[PDB]
Design a protein around this ligand. Sequence first.
Ligand code: NAI
Length: 134
Amino acid sequence: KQFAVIGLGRFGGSIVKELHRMGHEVLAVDINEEKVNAYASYATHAVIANATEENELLSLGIRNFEYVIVAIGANIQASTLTTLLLKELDIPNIWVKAQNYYHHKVLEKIGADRIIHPEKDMGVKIAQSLSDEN
Ligand SMILES: NC(=O)C1=CN([C@@H]2O[C@H](COP(=O)(O)OP(=O)(O)OC[C@H]3O[C@@H](n4cnc5c(N)ncnc54)[C@H](O)[C@@H]3O)[C@@H](O)[C@H]2O)C=CC1
């Protein structure tokens, strides 16, 4: 029902723009307001928070998003700690972007419903499109 994207880089911000362009409402959170301000026009609600902190997550109300996406970047701990925190919030679905075989492997066992490798996955998606192209 609900969609929450944590981390507004090229990936996360993109998935926030699309869900908007598709007519869905999104909660878009990040730690530096520059980012939050950059998507205020696309998110049904854009907030400034540190998703690694227990309390900010409750003032976020994340407890009620069927889907949450951890699209944080070059910072692996925040990523996992965040996915770890909310994993304990009982979020039915948490998808996380990954960049490490290591990272992937921990997320895997932490209980992440879906791990994403933009580069690898986009890879298969294209080979896919090539075959389709005839
Ligand atoms: N998703 C991941 O865990 C990882 C990604 N990487 C790689 O790092 C590269 C850099 O990617 P970008 O998206 O451009 O990274 P980036 O540093 O530009 O953006 C990450 C975003 O998440 C935001 N954010 C929101 N809440 C945060 C919090 N509590 N702590 C930290 N950041 C928070 C940051 O402020 C920022 O906008 C990527 O291409 C990715 O492949 C490397 C390690 C982990």
